[PDB]
Amino acid sequence: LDVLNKKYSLLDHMQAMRRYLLLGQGDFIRHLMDLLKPELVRPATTLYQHNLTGILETAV
Amino acid sequence: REIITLQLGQCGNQIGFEFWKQLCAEHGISPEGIVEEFATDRKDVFFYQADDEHYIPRAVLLDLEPRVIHSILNSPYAKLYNPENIYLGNNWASGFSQGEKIHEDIFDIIDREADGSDSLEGFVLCHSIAGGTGSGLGSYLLERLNDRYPKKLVQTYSVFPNQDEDVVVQPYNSLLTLKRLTQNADCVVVLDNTALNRIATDRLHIQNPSFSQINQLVSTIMSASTTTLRYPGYMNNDLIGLIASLIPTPRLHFLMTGYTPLTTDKTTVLDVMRRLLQPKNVMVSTNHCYIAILNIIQGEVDPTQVHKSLQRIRERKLANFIPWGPASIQVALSRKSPYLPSAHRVSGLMMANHTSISSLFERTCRQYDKLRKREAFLEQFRKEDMFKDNFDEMDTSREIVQQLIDEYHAATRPDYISWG
Amino acid sequence: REIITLQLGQCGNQIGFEFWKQLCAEHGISPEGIVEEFATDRKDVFFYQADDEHYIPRAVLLDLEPRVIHSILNSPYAKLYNPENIYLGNNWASGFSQGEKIHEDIFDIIDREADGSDSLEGFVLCHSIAGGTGSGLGSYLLERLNDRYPKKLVQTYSVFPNQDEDVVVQPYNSLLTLKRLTQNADCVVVLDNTALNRIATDRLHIQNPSFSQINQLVSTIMSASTTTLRYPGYMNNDLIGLIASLIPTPRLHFLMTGYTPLTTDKTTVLDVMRRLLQPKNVMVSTNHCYIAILNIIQGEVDPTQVHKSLQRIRERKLANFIPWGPASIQVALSRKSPYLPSAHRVSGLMMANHTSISSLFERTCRQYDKLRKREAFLEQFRKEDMFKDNFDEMDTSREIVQQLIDEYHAATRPDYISWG
Amino acid sequence: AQQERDVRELVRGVAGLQDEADPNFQLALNFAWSNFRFHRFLDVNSHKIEKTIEGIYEKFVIHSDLSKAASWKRLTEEFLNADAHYSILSLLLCLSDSPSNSSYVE
Amino acid sequence: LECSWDELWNKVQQAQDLDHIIAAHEVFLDTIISRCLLDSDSRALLNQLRAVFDQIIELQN
């Protein structure tokens, strides 16, 4: 258990399993969806993955 | 998001300085702007990032016939920001007329930081009612930012001047500024100078050095107002998320204050909740009932006794709310602030809508009616004559605030489904 | 390949001297021509190889009524080259008429080094607009090299004279020379004397010794323009490889400048990229949008954060380009120059096409229209009367540059698929 | 033979043109047959179809619509037991590829 | 996310077996499945929740 929680960082993954997926941080995910408003308002015909994977980085 | 804070007047600049100094104390930063290398949290809530571990705070200071601004100026807390925004009668018309001519250059100073700010949420006004030079000037500038920005939020921290008595034009100034406050402001945080004087005489036996200890209480409330934003919470990490529940309609947008110690020279969250219900612990002084309450706790976390306390404040039955609506007092939990020593590790804060302040408004209205009929208290200067030859704008202001009192008393009733 | 550099006029010879002196500083060579024995790179980009570790620089200097050329002459930097090419009114017609008669011997001096040069790429003009003797003479010589060489490229480093005001024939001179610039030049690098004055008053508080510090900034830009050629890069190691992306059509061939420090008395490539986007850091001062940009970086190399920064300047959205086209700001990385001490080890440079300079052109056009209608500012000498009795060539020049303004504004539109 | 009557009936049904002596009927029919004979698609990839069906099932399980997920799996597995299968599936898929997500009350 | 986070945080922070970490994850997730309206029985509640979400987008119009 000792080598697992530091060499592969088991606990840190749980901590960010809460913060991001369960919104357990809240701030970063709110700044995502604030910036993600024009794209989600747009029809998904003309949405492509480069626009999502770009704006996520500006957020981070 | 990001909020540019806006201070004018003598007292308003004092709270702007005091709040920014207290935020320097709260974050792990030097008073010179340098961030500490022994420091998790956010230090970018209101701060422009320079390089030298410099988060330059985003605050614009304004002055008119400056006295106390010079004493603010010579300080080690003047090296944190000051992007060179200093720019130079005690009536409302004095501040209004003097702001009239110079509005463009101070608004250019505003637009400077506006394009400087990539992100924006709101503008916070550090105002003082019947402060003389602050009155008129602040309402004029409030009209200008509202006219220029229909996309932004405005919250005003303003004093209610009542110290049980000399200035005789005070109800006139408060009447006009409150007219601008009702129709040109999105958010109002009001406090009683009398109630803070009462709590100051509670915690000590001072009468002369009241101002500095008043600064202590106001800095506590102002820091507690922003703790959910400056430290990562989960909801009301924006101004608007905090604001939206509190205002059911923009005639009811005046917000109440609370701080749970009386003297600041295990208790569960229920106890501070139940006494934050008490009006002896509220810092602002038929039956009045709350329209919506939100409470905020920062300190020791009992993970299940929250809902246990919730059932308890229910069945206590100390506060019955608005009849014609689903009005709840609502719970927020935040982190207690690191990087500073703290007495009273549990600390509470209430934001609410209550109908009790309509009494204070009709007090000012009745005093204004008395002085207006008695006709010796407008003090007849060239400012007021050039502003209005016939002085009907004050009459219109009294009419509108009387209409607002009528709206308050009609909202006080169990039936406010019909208009008025 | 090899480029013969061509300087005339007082200011143009000053930058020719300053650039060649700075290249002496940059390469491991003495000011006497001797290459250093403590020295990888190329020292043959513009230099004829003699024996005594002598790379003789390939530069032809030209003068008319010389004042500053004598001060250039007595120097230890006059022993690097000078293959004996010295050869002797402030109007355009003065320089034009005086160049008219002596064109053959200076062109023979040109042909001397032309057969002397085994390899050739282009000719660089060190010009100054409204410099008096430089004006007219430079445009005449430009016409002659274009007429003789349809196989070669011409780039002109020229000043835009605007110092906020006396010479009243200046818009006439600029108008005629710009007519020759549009139709007889392949490449134009323009800068604002006003913007360099602004940045000089930014970095210091000088007003009188502006010329020497202007020489500093121009030498930095001129060295950065040639770093990819003088030091082995991979692309734009030729003039034409650099030029070809920048000009989408030879009415749009006027190129913009950039240098990333303001004061020259870890930061990533993104930061200098994003602020080389800002017009306060551009050394040349409806919505204008860029037609093509190329940026050049010399310094610290982060091998993957280039593309990371690229995605970042994308999603930043500070610069939206031309609608009717695939216009990108494009990245070039070069070696930071050895053999000299350097402050600001990271340094950036932008070449772009922007529509903003059409404003400066219509400024000169409107001033010319005013002075031409007012009719006291042609200054009526024998040069102008012998050159044109009826003075319609200036009218034709104004017509052509007005047509060019129309082309600029039509290119500014989202539709420039139709002509005009 | 039956093919031709079918293309007639398809025009009648989808286009709402029940009179063969309308010129619009013959124009729609000529359009339909000219579209059929303009060979411009690759033949149906059964594996890509299978992937798409499985993904539809995953989208149903992600959205907690279990009655729809169970119905989707059950109906598709029954249909794929006795080429033309994957054909009709791709047909329906392209046909209304809008979102079509609610469709409850099995 | 404060009760269930605490439950999970206890049965991970003590856990003397890797299996106890595992059987801690399992139940914490399934408790969240139950507290949210995601069961084969609580469909009827979710159905009304979707109709309380409908009128929000209706009012905007």
Side-chain angles (χ1 to χ4, degrees), chain B residues 326-353:
Chain B
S328 151
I329 174 176
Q330 304 195 350
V331 49
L333 166 61
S334 88
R335 347 182 132 174
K336 171 81 174 190
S337 170
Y339 298 142
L340 81 168
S342 252
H344 308 126
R345 297 277 164 197
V346 217
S347 182
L349 169 68
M350 52 145 313
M351 224 48 40
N353 229 292

PDB file of all heavy atoms in Angstrom, chain B residues 326-353:
ATOM      1  N   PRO B 326     -42.105  30.395  -0.834  1.00  0.00           N
ATOM      2  CA  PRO B 326     -41.219  29.410  -0.203  1.00  0.00           C
ATOM      3  C   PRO B 326     -39.883  30.005   0.213  1.00  0.00           C
ATOM      4  O   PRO B 326     -38.888  29.856  -0.501  1.00  0.00           O
ATOM      5  CB  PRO B 326     -41.032  28.357  -1.304  1.00  0.00           C
ATOM      6  CG  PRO B 326     -41.685  28.936  -2.565  1.00  0.00           C
ATOM      7  CD  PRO B 326     -41.983  30.370  -2.298  1.00  0.00           C
ATOM      8  N   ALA B 327     -39.858  30.693   1.349  1.00  0.00           N
ATOM      9  CA  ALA B 327     -38.671  31.409   1.789  1.00  0.00           C
ATOM     10  C   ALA B 327     -37.898  30.632   2.843  1.00  0.00           C
ATOM     11  O   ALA B 327     -38.407  30.387   3.937  1.00  0.00           O
ATOM     12  CB  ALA B 327     -39.065  32.756   2.365  1.00  0.00           C
ATOM     13  N   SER B 328     -36.645  30.293   2.544  1.00  0.00           N
ATOM     14  CA  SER B 328     -35.830  29.554   3.500  1.00  0.00           C
ATOM     15  C   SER B 328     -34.598  30.355   3.899  1.00  0.00           C
ATOM     16  O   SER B 328     -34.032  31.107   3.098  1.00  0.00           O
ATOM     17  CB  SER B 328     -35.406  28.198   2.929  1.00  0.00           C
ATOM     18  OG  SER B 328     -34.164  27.783   3.477  1.00  0.00           O
ATOM     19  N   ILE B 329     -34.194  30.188   5.161  1.00  0.00           N
ATOM     20  CA  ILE B 329     -32.831  30.508   5.558  1.00  0.00           C
ATOM     21  C   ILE B 329     -31.917  29.357   5.161  1.00  0.00           C
ATOM     22  O   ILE B 329     -32.194  28.186   5.446  1.00  0.00           O
ATOM     23  CB  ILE B 329     -32.750  30.821   7.063  1.00  0.00           C
ATOM     24  CG1 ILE B 329     -31.289  31.022   7.494  1.00  0.00           C
ATOM     25  CG2 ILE B 329     -33.533  29.814   7.901  1.00  0.00           C
ATOM     26  CD1 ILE B 329     -31.127  31.429   8.930  1.00  0.00           C
ATOM     27  N   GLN B 330     -30.842  29.687   4.445  1.00  0.00           N
ATOM     28  CA  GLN B 330     -30.072  28.694   3.709  1.00  0.00           C
ATOM     29  C   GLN B 330     -28.623  28.701   4.162  1.00  0.00           C
ATOM     30  O   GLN B 330     -28.103  29.735   4.586  1.00  0.00           O
ATOM     31  CB  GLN B 330     -30.166  28.951   2.218  1.00  0.00           C
ATOM     32  CG  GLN B 330     -31.601  28.968   1.766  1.00  0.00           C
ATOM     33  CD  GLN B 330     -31.753  28.855   0.287  1.00  0.00           C
ATOM     34  OE1 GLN B 330     -30.793  28.943  -0.475  1.00  0.00           O
ATOM     35  NE2 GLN B 330     -32.986  28.685  -0.141  1.00  0.00           N
ATOM     36  N   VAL B 331     -27.986  27.535   4.091  1.00  0.00           N
ATOM     37  CA  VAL B 331     -26.723  27.267   4.770  1.00  0.00           C
ATOM     38  C   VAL B 331     -25.574  27.267   3.765  1.00  0.00           C
ATOM     39  O   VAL B 331     -25.676  26.678   2.683  1.00  0.00           O
ATOM     40  CB  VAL B 331     -26.816  25.941   5.551  1.00  0.00           C
ATOM     41  CG1 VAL B 331     -27.377  24.821   4.675  1.00  0.00           C
ATOM     42  CG2 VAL B 331     -25.468  25.542   6.150  1.00  0.00           C
ATOM     43  N   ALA B 332     -24.491  27.971   4.100  1.00  0.00           N
ATOM     44  CA  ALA B 332     -23.257  27.884   3.336  1.00  0.00           C
ATOM     45  C   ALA B 332     -22.086  27.676   4.285  1.00  0.00           C
ATOM     46  O   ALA B 332     -21.988  28.332   5.323  1.00  0.00           O
ATOM     47  CB  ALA B 332     -23.027  29.136   2.482  1.00  0.00           C
ATOM     48  N   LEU B 333     -21.191  26.764   3.903  1.00  0.00           N
ATOM     49  CA  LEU B 333     -20.028  26.397   4.698  1.00  0.00           C
ATOM     50  C   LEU B 333     -18.772  26.677   3.890  1.00  0.00           C
ATOM     51  O   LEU B 333     -18.682  26.304   2.719  1.00  0.00           O
ATOM     52  CB  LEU B 333     -20.075  24.917   5.111  1.00  0.00           C
ATOM     53  CG  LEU B 333     -18.800  24.273   5.664  1.00  0.00           C
ATOM     54  CD1 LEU B 333     -18.322  24.952   6.946  1.00  0.00           C
ATOM     55  CD2 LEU B 333     -19.014  22.787   5.893  1.00  0.00           C
ATOM     56  N   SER B 334     -17.803  27.328   4.520  1.00  0.00           N
ATOM     57  CA  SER B 334     -16.584  27.732   3.837  1.00  0.00           C
ATOM     58  C   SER B 334     -15.386  27.401   4.714  1.00  0.00           C
ATOM     59  O   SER B 334     -15.523  27.054   5.890  1.00  0.00           O
ATOM     60  CB  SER B 334     -16.606  29.226   3.489  1.00  0.00           C
ATOM     61  OG  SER B 334     -16.102  30.009   4.544  1.00  0.00           O
ATOM     62  N   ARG B 335     -14.199  27.518   4.128  1.00  0.00           N
ATOM     63  CA  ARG B 335     -12.965  27.255   4.851  1.00  0.00           C
ATOM     64  C   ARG B 335     -12.635  28.458   5.721  1.00  0.00           C
ATOM     65  O   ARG B 335     -12.804  29.607   5.306  1.00  0.00           O
ATOM     66  CB  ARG B 335     -11.815  26.994   3.877  1.00  0.00           C
ATOM     67  CG  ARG B 335     -12.267  26.745   2.440  1.00  0.00           C
ATOM     68  CD  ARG B 335     -11.100  26.436   1.515  1.00  0.00           C
ATOM     69  NE  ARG B 335     -11.349  25.253   0.692  1.00  0.00           N
ATOM     70  CZ  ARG B 335     -10.547  24.836  -0.282  1.00  0.00           C
ATOM     71  NH1 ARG B 335      -9.424  25.488  -0.545  1.00  0.00           N
ATOM     72  NH2 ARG B 335     -10.856  23.753  -0.981  1.00  0.00           N
ATOM     73  N   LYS B 336     -12.172  28.195   6.939  1.00  0.00           N
ATOM     74  CA  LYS B 336     -11.677  29.270   7.785  1.00  0.00           C
ATOM     75  C   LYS B 336     -10.320  29.718   7.245  1.00  0.00           C
ATOM     76  O   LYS B 336      -9.519  28.893   6.796  1.00  0.00           O
ATOM     77  CB  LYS B 336     -11.602  28.804   9.241  1.00  0.00           C
ATOM     78  CG  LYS B 336     -10.899  29.752  10.194  1.00  0.00           C
ATOM     79  CD  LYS B 336     -11.874  30.838  10.610  1.00  0.00           C
ATOM     80  CE  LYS B 336     -11.321  31.760  11.682  1.00  0.00           C
ATOM     81  NZ  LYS B 336     -12.407  32.632  12.215  1.00  0.00           N
ATOM     82  N   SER B 337     -10.072  31.033   7.266  1.00  0.00           N
ATOM     83  CA  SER B 337      -8.997  31.615   6.471  1.00  0.00           C
ATOM     84  C   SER B 337      -7.625  31.299   7.065  1.00  0.00           C
ATOM     85  O   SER B 337      -7.372  31.580   8.242  1.00  0.00           O
ATOM     86  CB  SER B 337      -9.167  33.128   6.351  1.00  0.00           C
ATOM     87  OG  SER B 337      -8.013  33.725   5.776  1.00  0.00           O
ATOM     88  N   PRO B 338      -6.726  30.715   6.277  1.00  0.00           N
ATOM     89  CA  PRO B 338      -5.331  30.554   6.701  1.00  0.00           C
ATOM     90  C   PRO B 338      -4.542  31.844   6.546  1.00  0.00           C
ATOM     91  O   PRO B 338      -5.093  32.879   6.161  1.00  0.00           O
ATOM     92  CB  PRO B 338      -4.801  29.468   5.761  1.00  0.00           C
ATOM     93  CG  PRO B 338      -5.615  29.618   4.526  1.00  0.00           C
ATOM     94  CD  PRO B 338      -6.949  30.201   4.916  1.00  0.00           C
ATOM     95  N   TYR B 339      -3.269  31.777   6.965  1.00  0.00           N
ATOM     96  CA  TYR B 339      -2.210  32.785   6.811  1.00  0.00           C
ATOM     97  C   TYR B 339      -2.374  33.929   7.799  1.00  0.00           C
ATOM     98  O   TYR B 339      -1.704  34.957   7.672  1.00  0.00           O
ATOM     99  CB  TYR B 339      -2.112  33.364   5.390  1.00  0.00           C
ATOM    100  CG  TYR B 339      -1.780  32.370   4.318  1.00  0.00           C
ATOM    101  CD1 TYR B 339      -2.368  32.464   3.067  1.00  0.00           C
ATOM    102  CD2 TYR B 339      -0.876  31.342   4.551  1.00  0.00           C
ATOM    103  CE1 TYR B 339      -2.069  31.560   2.068  1.00  0.00           C
ATOM    104  CE2 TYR B 339      -0.567  30.430   3.560  1.00  0.00           C
ATOM    105  CZ  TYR B 339      -1.169  30.545   2.319  1.00  0.00           C
ATOM    106  OH  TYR B 339      -0.871  29.644   1.325  1.00  0.00           O
ATOM    107  N   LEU B 340      -3.268  33.780   8.767  1.00  0.00           N
ATOM    108  CA  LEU B 340      -3.386  34.787   9.806  1.00  0.00           C
ATOM    109  C   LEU B 340      -3.857  34.139  11.104  1.00  0.00           C
ATOM    110  O   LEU B 340      -4.602  33.153  11.078  1.00  0.00           O
ATOM    111  CB  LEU B 340      -4.343  35.910   9.388  1.00  0.00           C
ATOM    112  CG  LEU B 340      -5.862  35.777   9.510  1.00  0.00           C
ATOM    113  CD1 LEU B 340      -6.517  37.132   9.306  1.00  0.00           C
ATOM    114  CD2 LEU B 340      -6.436  34.776   8.528  1.00  0.00           C
ATOM    115  N   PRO B 341      -3.384  34.630  12.249  1.00  0.00           N
ATOM    116  CA  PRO B 341      -3.928  34.183  13.539  1.00  0.00           C
ATOM    117  C   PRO B 341      -5.370  34.631  13.724  1.00  0.00           C
ATOM    118  O   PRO B 341      -5.735  35.758  13.371  1.00  0.00           O
ATOM    119  CB  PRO B 341      -2.999  34.850  14.564  1.00  0.00           C
ATOM    120  CG  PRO B 341      -2.338  35.977  13.811  1.00  0.00           C
ATOM    121  CD  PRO B 341      -2.189  35.470  12.417  1.00  0.00           C
ATOM    122  N   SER B 342      -6.196  33.742  14.284  1.00  0.00           N
ATOM    123  CA  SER B 342      -7.616  34.048  14.381  1.00  0.00           C
ATOM    124  C   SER B 342      -8.215  33.654  15.720  1.00  0.00           C
ATOM    125  O   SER B 342      -8.172  32.486  16.110  1.00  0.00           O
ATOM    126  CB  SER B 342      -8.382  33.375  13.245  1.00  0.00           C
ATOM    127  OG  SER B 342      -8.812  34.336  12.289  1.00  0.00           O
ATOM    128  N   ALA B 343      -8.789  34.635  16.413  1.00  0.00           N
ATOM    129  CA  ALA B 343      -9.699  34.379  17.520  1.00  0.00           C
ATOM    130  C   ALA B 343     -11.094  34.119  16.966  1.00  0.00           C
ATOM    131  O   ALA B 343     -11.434  34.622  15.890  1.00  0.00           O
ATOM    132  CB  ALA B 343      -9.713  35.556  18.493  1.00  0.00           C
ATOM    133  N   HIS B 344     -11.884  33.317  17.697  1.00  0.00           N
ATOM    134  CA  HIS B 344     -13.213  32.844  17.303  1.00  0.00           C
ATOM    135  C   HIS B 344     -13.153  32.086  15.982  1.00  0.00           C
ATOM    136  O   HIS B 344     -13.595  32.593  14.946  1.00  0.00           O
ATOM    137  CB  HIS B 344     -14.240  33.978  17.236  1.00  0.00           C
ATOM    138  CG  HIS B 344     -14.300  34.806  18.479  1.00  0.00           C
ATOM    139  ND1 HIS B 344     -14.168  36.174  18.463  1.00  0.00           N
ATOM    140  CD2 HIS B 344     -14.436  34.459  19.780  1.00  0.00           C
ATOM    141  CE1 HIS B 344     -14.250  36.640  19.695  1.00  0.00           C
ATOM    142  NE2 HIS B 344     -14.413  35.620  20.515  1.00  0.00           N
ATOM    143  N   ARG B 345     -12.551  30.888  16.028  1.00  0.00           N
ATOM    144  CA  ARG B 345     -12.343  30.035  14.858  1.00  0.00           C
ATOM    145  C   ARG B 345     -13.639  29.702  14.122  1.00  0.00           C
ATOM    146  O   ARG B 345     -13.613  29.422  12.922  1.00  0.00           O
ATOM    147  CB  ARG B 345     -11.648  28.741  15.284  1.00  0.00           C
ATOM    148  CG  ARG B 345     -10.258  28.949  15.856  1.00  0.00           C
ATOM    149  CD  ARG B 345      -9.216  29.068  14.763  1.00  0.00           C
ATOM    150  NE  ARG B 345      -7.972  29.632  15.273  1.00  0.00           N
ATOM    151  CZ  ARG B 345      -7.014  30.148  14.511  1.00  0.00           C
ATOM    152  NH1 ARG B 345      -7.157  30.188  13.194  1.00  0.00           N
ATOM    153  NH2 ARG B 345      -5.920  30.643  15.071  1.00  0.00           N
ATOM    154  N   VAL B 346     -14.771  29.705  14.814  1.00  0.00           N
ATOM    155  CA  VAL B 346     -16.082  29.654  14.178  1.00  0.00           C
ATOM    156  C   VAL B 346     -16.591  31.087  14.062  1.00  0.00           C
ATOM    157  O   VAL B 346     -16.586  31.835  15.047  1.00  0.00           O
ATOM    158  CB  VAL B 346     -17.062  28.771  14.967  1.00  0.00           C
ATOM    159  CG1 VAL B 346     -17.959  27.991  14.013  1.00  0.00           C
ATOM    160  CG2 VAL B 346     -16.310  27.824  15.910  1.00  0.00           C
ATOM    161  N   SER B 347     -17.013  31.480  12.858  1.00  0.00           N
ATOM    162  CA  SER B 347     -17.537  32.820  12.615  1.00  0.00           C
ATOM    163  C   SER B 347     -18.656  32.745  11.586  1.00  0.00           C
ATOM    164  O   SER B 347     -18.543  32.013  10.598  1.00  0.00           O
ATOM    165  CB  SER B 347     -16.441  33.770  12.124  1.00  0.00           C
ATOM    166  OG  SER B 347     -16.963  35.074  11.940  1.00  0.00           O
ATOM    167  N   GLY B 348     -19.726  33.512  11.812  1.00  0.00           N
ATOM    168  CA  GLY B 348     -20.918  33.415  10.997  1.00  0.00           C
ATOM    169  C   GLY B 348     -21.269  34.739  10.344  1.00  0.00           C
ATOM    170  O   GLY B 348     -20.790  35.802  10.743  1.00  0.00           O
ATOM    171  N   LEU B 349     -22.113  34.650   9.320  1.00  0.00           N
ATOM    172  CA  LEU B 349     -22.513  35.795   8.518  1.00  0.00           C
ATOM    173  C   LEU B 349     -23.889  35.536   7.936  1.00  0.00           C
ATOM    174  O   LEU B 349     -24.157  34.462   7.397  1.00  0.00           O
ATOM    175  CB  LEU B 349     -21.513  36.058   7.383  1.00  0.00           C
ATOM    176  CG  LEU B 349     -21.927  37.066   6.303  1.00  0.00           C
ATOM    177  CD1 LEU B 349     -21.998  38.470   6.862  1.00  0.00           C
ATOM    178  CD2 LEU B 349     -20.972  37.045   5.140  1.00  0.00           C
ATOM    179  N   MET B 350     -24.755  36.540   8.023  1.00  0.00           N
ATOM    180  CA  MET B 350     -26.086  36.451   7.451  1.00  0.00           C
ATOM    181  C   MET B 350     -26.248  37.514   6.378  1.00  0.00           C
ATOM    182  O   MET B 350     -25.800  38.654   6.536  1.00  0.00           O
ATOM    183  CB  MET B 350     -27.179  36.599   8.519  1.00  0.00           C
ATOM    184  CG  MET B 350     -27.004  37.823   9.387  1.00  0.00           C
ATOM    185  SD  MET B 350     -28.462  38.699   9.962  1.00  0.00           S
ATOM    186  CE  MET B 350     -29.405  38.809   8.467  1.00  0.00           C
ATOM    187  N   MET B 351     -26.836  37.107   5.265  1.00  0.00           N
ATOM    188  CA  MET B 351     -27.394  38.018   4.282  1.00  0.00           C
ATOM    189  C   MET B 351     -28.882  37.723   4.246  1.00  0.00           C
ATOM    190  O   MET B 351     -29.280  36.555   4.157  1.00  0.00           O
ATOM    191  CB  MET B 351     -26.765  37.835   2.900  1.00  0.00           C
ATOM    192  CG  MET B 351     -26.383  39.140   2.138  1.00  0.00           C
ATOM    193  SD  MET B 351     -25.469  40.537   2.855  1.00  0.00           S
ATOM    194  CE  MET B 351     -24.217  39.748   3.877  1.00  0.00           C
ATOM    195  N   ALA B 352     -29.701  38.763   4.359  1.00  0.00           N
ATOM    196  CA  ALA B 352     -31.139  38.566   4.349  1.00  0.00           C
ATOM    197  C   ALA B 352     -31.850  39.760   3.738  1.00  0.00           C
ATOM    198  O   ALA B 352     -31.259  40.819   3.523  1.00  0.00           O
ATOM    199  CB  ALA B 352     -31.704  38.320   5.741  1.00  0.00           C
ATOM    200  N   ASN B 353     -33.115  39.545   3.404  1.00  0.00           N
ATOM    201  CA  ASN B 353     -34.055  40.623   3.135  1.00  0.00           C
ATOM    202  C   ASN B 353     -35.044  40.661   4.296  1.00  0.00           C
ATOM    203  O   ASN B 353     -35.690  39.654   4.606  1.00  0.00           O
ATOM    204  CB  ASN B 353     -34.770  40.414   1.801  1.00  0.00           C
ATOM    205  CG  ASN B 353     -34.761  41.664   0.922  1.00  0.00           C
ATOM    206  OD1 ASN B 353     -35.402  42.668   1.239  1.00  0.00           O
ATOM    207  ND2 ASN B 353     -34.059  41.590  -0.204  1.00  0.00           N
TER     208      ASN B 353
END
